[PDB]
Amino acid sequence: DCLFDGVNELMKTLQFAVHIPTFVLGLLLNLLAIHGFSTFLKNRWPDYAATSIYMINLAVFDLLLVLSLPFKMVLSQVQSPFPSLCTLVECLYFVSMYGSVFTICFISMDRFLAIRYPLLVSHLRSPRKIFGICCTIWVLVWTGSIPIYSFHGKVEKYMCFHNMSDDTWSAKVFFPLEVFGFLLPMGIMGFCCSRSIHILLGRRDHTQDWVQQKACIYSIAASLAVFVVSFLPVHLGFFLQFLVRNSFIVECRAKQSISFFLQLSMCFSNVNCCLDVFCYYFVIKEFRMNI
Amino acid sequence: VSAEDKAAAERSKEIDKCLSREKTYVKRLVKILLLGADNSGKSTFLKQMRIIHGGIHEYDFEIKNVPFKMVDVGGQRSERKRWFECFDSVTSILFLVDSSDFNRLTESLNDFETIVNNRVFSNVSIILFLNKTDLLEEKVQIVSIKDYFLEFEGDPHCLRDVQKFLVECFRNKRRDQQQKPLYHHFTTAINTENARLIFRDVKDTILHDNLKQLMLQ
Amino acid sequence: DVQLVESGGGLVQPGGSRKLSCSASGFAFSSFGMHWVRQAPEKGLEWVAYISSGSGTIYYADTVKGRFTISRDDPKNTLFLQMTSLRSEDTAMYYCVRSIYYYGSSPFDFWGGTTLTVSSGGGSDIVMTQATSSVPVTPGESVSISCRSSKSLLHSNGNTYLYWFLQRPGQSPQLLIYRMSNLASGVPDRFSGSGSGTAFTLTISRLEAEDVGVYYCMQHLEYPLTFGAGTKLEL
Amino acid sequence: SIAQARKLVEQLKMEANIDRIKVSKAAADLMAYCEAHAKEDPLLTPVPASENPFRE
Amino acid sequence: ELDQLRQEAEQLKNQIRDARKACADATLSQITNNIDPVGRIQMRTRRTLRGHLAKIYAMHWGTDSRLLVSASQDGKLIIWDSYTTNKVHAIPLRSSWVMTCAYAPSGNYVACGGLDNICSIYNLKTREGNVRVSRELAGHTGYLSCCRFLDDNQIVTSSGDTTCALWDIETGQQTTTFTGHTGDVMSLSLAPDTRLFVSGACDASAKLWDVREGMCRQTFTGHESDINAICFFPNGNAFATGSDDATCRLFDLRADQELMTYSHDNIICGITSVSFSKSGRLLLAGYDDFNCNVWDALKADRAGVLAGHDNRVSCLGVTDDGMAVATGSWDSFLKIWN
Ligand SMILES: Cc1cccc(N2CCN(C(=O)c3cc(S(=O)(=O)N(C)C)ccc3N3CCCC3)CC2)c1C
Ligand SMILES: *[C@@H]1O[C@H](CO)[C@@H](O[C@@H]2O[C@H](CO)[C@@H](O)[C@H](O)[C@H]2NC(C)=O)[C@H](O)[C@H]1NC(C)=O
Ligand SMILES: CC(C)CCC[C@@H](C)[C@H]1CC[C@H]2[C@@H]3CC=C4C[C@@H](O)CC[C@]4(C)[C@H]3CC[C@]12C
């Protein structure tokens, strides 16, 4: 009724071939990003302090995912020396993923708020509030991971990312995870990006210099496109694997393909650690002038 | 420290509290440097604004609970650097032009070029008010625009063509265009919608500042 | 004209309560610290309370601590002293004193007066001693008044917080010398102030009939503010 | 025109009538003043921290 | 007749230049060549005076070398205790466009002025305990650029109307007017003896005036741009001036000509302020490049730099005892250096 041997070996080959270049590229890309935005923080604080803080936050989450990647590559094909090392590696990896997701969402919401309410944001926006929001993001991801990974005691996983228990995949835990990690973030991101673009396009009525902000429109559109490409298929695979676990898709060759798609999409989801750099940091003229 | 030193430190702390209290207000204050001319209708425009909304001359008013400060430097207008850098932190410059008087356009355009091309006013937006538009539309039929501007192309008696030509000549004087927005309005001093237009332009300038802060490009 | 007018004093039974008020006019009351100073009948000055220009710090004398309350109403320019459980030792004449505190200011430069009478029904404190109680002298002849402090009033910042006051018969005290050397505004140059770390002298070059009264030395080095016994000066 | 020209000519004549010492004498006097007061300049010679009321 | 007057003026200028050249025999650099260098000077920010809400335009030390007054674009005059950083007074101004301030030598008054064309006198020792305006000197048709007290009753102001004026504060009228500058007067310095004062204007010239007689004693023209600052040598026989041409210059009264030029190739920004140390050995100049340069006044060598401000250094000041230096900047901060 089921078999996942060839799927597992093909996925091992593909995950090596995708995660090695992803690790290598993301390492230097995020180190360069952190260096550049730290230079901005120490050089041009009054005008770029609030944005640089959450840019560094996103870069640090991406770098944490990059550093957890080699453990994912090795531990998924070799026996775990300790029973709980797999849980720690998984926690670091997924906390990095979802912290990056929430940082991206907060960036989009900040941009939309600044565009839609320029006076209020000009009065209220400050580096300390952005720093507090970043701290809240870190606290939320890290204190949401613990109540989830505490139940991974009955898993009995000799290799990581292979043996997930019906504690996080039950509806009462799976569906809130999907809603609060993908569905709500994607809805917020789509609304915020679309409204920002609509408002920036509506400036033809006030001034003929609205064409100066076409690049901002392109950047926001690229942010939406990169978010959808990097995080939609992986959660589609999560939902599909949920359907397999609940016997909605039971006939063979469909469970194997769903597992292969889930693993491959999770491998390609982590490419966002470089797509984030290209989408948020290299679009900045000053950042690319520094580099 | 002694008791009198402690009490002096208390007095300094109270002064600090007053200064910090006043700091919030000055952050939300919008300063506009008025640079009209004698024929531009500056006096009538200011009188209308004062009626509707209740050295150097200053006019303080409020639009949508936003404190506005119009600085009038009529007469006491200098060309030295020190005088100019006094206004380097104003939000925008309101340039008033009599659009009907075709004879004086060249001097007005030269003054506009000198004002908007100053490196001091690089972080301020420009609000251009072409006053006496009724006189302009009465004069366009009688007098051809091509007489004073051979570069004008279009129907001499078409009001829209003349307005477009005036706006283009004023916008073309701005050598550097990718720094701050420029806004132009065709209105009259007696018009009661000038404050709304000024507030809209200031809101767009602040939106531009917010966009620059976000490092979106 | 600067004026401090006090009211609320009167005959009070022991254990009762009273509220002294002081209306301030002719000066910026909000920027001045205020002191309450009382003088028992046929006795010297005794500081009782202090409230700063705002209300951040409030100081009381140990004798009135826990019983007296000092307060101010800046919009009304009024100073208040709420007394409770009054004893016979509270019978005195209470004055309020302006005291502004910045570099070069002159604290204790204006006084008032009001009288409270109650019916029949300190360690670390700096001791200020005026050796002579009465100096009989004639007009036109120079006089010198001495005062001694147990602790050195000179501070590491270079100031010597010693004050001289003159109280003419039937009049409120007026500042003569502030910080041991500085002449108060409106005081004739015939008054001079000299002293050392612990010993101080006040010299009057040419005696006049207006100089007759009691001279007080007060320290402002630390609270509580303590006065000398007072030296009389009569013809 | 003529009045301002006469005024400026008179001013120039007043400027020309002054007696000017040699540049060497002025330089020597400036050096002598600087050398005489060198010991009394706190900025030129950093004073000991004890005699500094601005020590932080 | 006009051509004859122009020719006479040109001949007088040529004769003055010839006399100045004849009196020039040996340069100050040659005379001071054998003197040992001052050496590198490293002053540090001893205090930072914060509290202003906008750019600081002017500052003046009190004669006690402890109190100073500062003028800022937020329409505020603040008197500081430099030793303790404490704020003694905070004086609101009717006009926020202040450009100069002064401290009376007695410490009883401060002066204010700017784009309102009025020199305002504020009384600091009032029986009411508050600072109130004591006098409003009007009569200048241009903005006020500098003001300096002679005593409690006399003050000298410079204006953008190309004139300087001596005022009697009690009557409020100009006792004397000083004319001859063809450009906006930017700065003025009083001689230590108070008998003379020197002025620098936008016509790239410096004029020495006699306060009593009221006429121009001498004119100095070596700069190629607007003069923004001017200061007297401690003995009163020389003065230094800084201009927009990225150059400071020292002029001698008796020699009636320039003695030394303080400039560097790396320096292209204009000079906002100049000041001498107590002995006159050090000339401190403020620049638009956010830094203050310490010059050896005798050797024209940059002996040090004060770099602690995030914006343009607008004002400078050395105490009467020479112990400290105050620097004001457009970043709304005052710094005491040592
Ligand atoms: C914010 C945060 C922090 C840490 C973990 C998570 N969470 C919950 C725990 N996590 C899983 O059970 C999980 C694991 C894997 S797999 O890679 O290890 N492998 C294939 C079995 C795949 C999907 C997973 N989940 C996503 C849907 C529900 C379950 C990962 C996502 C979150 C949302
Ligand atoms: C997933 O869990 C199963 C158990 O649910 C693991 O299978 C065990 O494998 C060990 C050796 O690794 C055997 O000793 C046990 O008998 C097996 N148990 C069962 C119930 O078959 C399996 O190895 C785990 N897979 C991974 C990839 O860690
Ligand atoms: C994405 C991160 C930062 C947010 C984490 C919060 C959400 C997604 C997770 C974290 C822990 C989860 C809970 C874990 C356990 C329980 C108890 C169970 O009886 C009902 C479901 C419930 C209550 C889960 C609902 C979803 C939940 C609240």
Residue numbers in the entry:
A (entry chain R): 9 to 299
B (entry chain A): 5 to 58, 68 to 230
C (entry chain F): 1 to 121, 133 to 246
D (entry chain G): 8 to 63
E (entry chain B): 21 to 358
Please give me the paper's original passages concerning this structure.
GPR55 is an orphan G protein-coupled receptor (GPCR) and represents a promising drug target for cancer, inflammation, and metabolic diseases. Here, we determine high-resolution cryo-electron microscopy structures of the activated GPR55 in complex with heterotrimeric G13 and two structurally diverse ligands: the putative endogenous agonist 1-palmitoyl-2-lysophosphatidylinositol (LPI) and the synthetic agonist ML184. Notably, an orthosteric binding site opening towards the membrane is observed in both structures, enabling direct interaction of the agonists with membrane lipids. The two structures of GPR55 were determined in the G protein-bound active state and are highly similar with an RMSD of 1.91 Å considering all atoms and 1.42 Å within the G protein heterotrimer.
The synthetic agonist ML184 binds to the hydrophobic cavity that is populated by the palmitoyl tail in the LPI-bound structure. Structural rearrangements, like the outward movement of the extracellular end of helix V by 3.5 Å, are required to accommodate the sterically more demanding ligand in this pocket. Accordingly, the binding mode of the synthetic agonist ML184 is characterized by hydrophobic contacts and aromatic stacking interactions. The phenyl ring adjacent to the sulfonamide forms multiple face-to-edge aromatic stacking interactions with F1023.33, W1775.34, as well as F2466.55 and is additionally stabilized by contacts to M172ECL2 and M2747.39. The sidechain of T1765.33 adopts a different rotamer in the ML184 structure (rotated by approximately 90°) and forms a direct hydrogen bond with the amide carbonyl of ML184. The pyrrolidine moiety of ML184 addresses a lipophilic sub-pocket formed by W1775.34, F1825.39, L1855.42, and F2466.55. The terminal dimethylphenyl ring is stabilized by aromatic stacking interactions with Y1063.37 and Y1574.61 and points towards the same membrane opening between helices IV and V as observed for the lipid tail in the LPI-bound structure. Remarkably, the ML184-structure revealed density that can be attributed to a cholesterol (CLR) molecule blocking the membrane opening within a cleft formed by helices IV and V. The CLR forms contacts to the dimethylphenyl moiety of ML184 and to F1103.41, L1484.52, V1494.53, I1564.60, K1805.37, P1845.41, and L1855.42. Direct interaction of R2536.62 with ML184 was not observed.
